[PDB]
Every structure is written in structure tokens, then in C-alpha cells.
RNA sequence: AAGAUGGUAAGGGCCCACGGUGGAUGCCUCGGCACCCGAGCCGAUGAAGGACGUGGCUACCUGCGAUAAGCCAGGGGGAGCCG
């Protein structure tokens, strides 16, 4: 959804790395707990893999502004 | 008493019906063939062609490559979709 790109265009220098470290953390427990809880997701593994890629496109756009 | 002496089928044949095994003929085709026209090179910014991985659960083809049944901009389209 566009509201993540609403705010992600602002954050230029270094904080966008540690803001996607924790969003990898947020799928680590989903990938662990897809063998016990295992049901109320199937949103959650495939939504996060898209909202990491749409935060790592802008991270290289805002470095090809330099190179 | 001297009779053409004859009616039986472990089994065999010919013909007529009724079923099994087999896959020819008829009718089709998302696949080919031969002539015509539009067109006619990619590559160390690393090619043609491949190995291995990627779906919540996956064996095999297709699509993609650690962002991996995908991401960001521009146009078309107008309604149901997650090969």
C-alpha cells in the first residue's frame, strides 16, 4: 500500500537500514511459528516479502542520486 | 430263427443365434508442409547455452534469481482475480 512510500521517500541517510532490520525480525517469528500457530497467517509471510522489497528499491534510488 | 438288421457320441464336422479378446474403417483436431510478403545480427556495461535454488503445505513443466508463483515509473483497459 502506498502509505509506506508516503513516508519512506523522506528518510535518506542511514536509518532506512535499521528500519528494515526489524522488518526482517518481524518475519523471523512467523517463519518459526508456521509450525505451531500456523493458521491465522498466509497474509503475513507474503505481505512482508513485498514490503521489504519496496523499502529496498528506494534505498538504492537514494544512492544512485549520488552514483 | 437268418433279418435294409437300428434307435447310442470319451470325441470331430458344417450352418444359425448370443457374449469375451483385439484394434482396423468413418467423422473430427489447439500439430505439421510448400510457396509469398514485414523484417533481419547479439557480445567483455560480460553473450548463445546451462547447474542450483524460489509458492503456507509440493513431485514435474512454465515464469523469475538472496528484492527469487516478483519491485518502481508512463500509457492502454474496465471488471472480477491470487500460472
Swiss-Prot record:
Gene3D superfamilies: 1.10.287.310
Any one Gene Ontology cellular component term annotated for this protein: cytosolic large ribosomal subunit
Matches recorded under CDD domains: Ribosomal_L29_HIP
PROSITE patterns, per database record: RIBOSOMAL_L29
Protein keywords: Ribonucleoprotein, Ribosomal protein
SUPFAM superfamilies associated with the record: Ribosomal protein L29 (L29p)
One of the record's GO molecular function terms: structural constituent of ribosome
Gene Ontology BP term (one): translation
InterPro entries: Ribosomal_protein_uL29 (IPR050063), Ribosomal_uL29 (IPR001854), Ribosomal_uL29_CS (IPR018254), Ribosomal_uL29_sf (IPR036049)
UniProt xrefs under PANTHER family: 60S RIBOSOMAL PROTEIN L35/50S RIBOSOMAL PROTEIN L29, LARGE RIBOSOMAL SUBUNIT PROTEIN UL29C
Family: Belongs to the universal ribosomal protein uL29 family.
Name of the protein in its database record: Large ribosomal subunit protein uL29
Species this protein is from: Thermus thermophilus
